[PDB]
Write a protein that binds this ligand. Structure first.
Ligand code: 0O3
Ligand code: SF4
Length: 309
């Protein structure tokens, strides 16, 4: 059994920064450090940090007065940032710069009273944060997930309309939704293609190349990781069996019985030690040296805030 590794895979720049933000806070100020929402969507990263004294909560009301609070990499609404601000709290913001970029555009549209449409998945914290940058009661902020949602949307002024996207979507599904938006609203304005980040695009491109060669694909990532789910889906749609797994213990022997080529990749929040343990398990089940595919080079790093060096 040949083991192939996708490239790129694993940590993006935003996740690396967000994790360092919480590790350095804990180091500078000692435990506890409160974090609103899982800092990134990975069970192993979250447990590692909790076991070091980060405490993960869902609402600002759970955080005591005097505390240090970190916003997750997914970002937060204005109302959240305001509730934190009115409270007696030291705040560090781990929001990925690439999410912040979308926030600034939503905020600009709000100020203009011009309506905006986000493509994204209902209930995701990134969507709640980005929708929550819009407050102008005179325009509007609408969420669509699919062409069918576009076909039912009505807006107040279709001559003044722009769109934004969640950072971790399917590049291909999002393309379909934009084509629908432009047919329904010919004067809609947007970025040249979408707001899907470089890491999400590259890991999709990499898993496409991986699935071309492998009969089975394992995607290391947590159930609630939106970008990881898109990797598994992509492979499945190319007709490969694909499984989303947190660690090596999730691998079922049947999944790889009589398989000649298995591929492994990792979503943007999954640490490389988990992939190493997956490879070790595949090897026990008969695989050989893991071979990395050639891949698009990633070179972007986002530094922690100077106050957290
Ligand atoms: C940290 C992120 C903000 O885009 C995304 C990368 O990590 P993850 O925490 O797995 O988020 P997603 O559920 O949006 O994919
Ligand atoms: S997946 Fe993209 S937007 Fe989300 S944290 Fe990573 S680099 Fe930032």
């Amino acid at each position: 059994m040949q083991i192939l590794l996708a490239n790129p895979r694993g940590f993006c720049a935003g996740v690396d920064r967000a994790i360092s933000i919480v590790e350095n806070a804990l180091a500078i100020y000692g435990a506890p450090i409160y974090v609103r929402h899982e800092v990134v969507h990975n069970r192993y990263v979250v447990d590692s940090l909790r076991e070091r004294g980060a405490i993960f909560i869902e609402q600002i009301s759970e955080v005591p007065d005097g505390a240090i609070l970190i916003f997750s990499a997914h970002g937060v609404s204005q109302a959240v940032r305001n509730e934190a601000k009115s409270r007696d709290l030291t705040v560090f913001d781990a929001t990925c710069p690439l999410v912040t970029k979308v926030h600034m555009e939503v905020a600009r549209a709000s100020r203009r009273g011009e309506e905006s449409i986000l493509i994204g998945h209902a209930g995701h914290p990134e969507v709640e944060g980005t929708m929550g940058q819009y407050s102008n009661p005179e325009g509007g902020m609408y969420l669509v997930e699919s062409p069918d949602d576009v076909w039912k949307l009505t807006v107040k002024n279709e001559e003044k309309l722009s769109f934004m996207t969640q950072t971790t979507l399917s590049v291909d599904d999002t393309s379909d939704v934009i084509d629908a938006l432009r047919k329904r609203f010919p004067k809609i304005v947007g970025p040249r293609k979408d707001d899907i980040c470089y890491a999400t695009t590259n890991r999709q491109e990499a898993v496409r190349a991986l699935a071309e060669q492998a009969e089975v694909v394992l995607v290391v990532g947590s159930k609630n990781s939106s970008n990881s789910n898109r990797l598994a889906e992509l492979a499945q749609r190319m007709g490969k069996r694909a499984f989303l797994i947190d660690d090596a213990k999730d691998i079922q022997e049947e999944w790889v019985k009589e398989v000649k080529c298995v591929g492994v990749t990792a979503g943007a929040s999954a640490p490389d030690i988990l992939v190493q343990n997956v490879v070790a398990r595949l090897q026990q089940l008969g695989g050989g040296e893991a071979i990395p595919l050639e891949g698009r080079e990633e070179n972007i790093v986002f530094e922690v805030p100077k106050e957290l060096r």
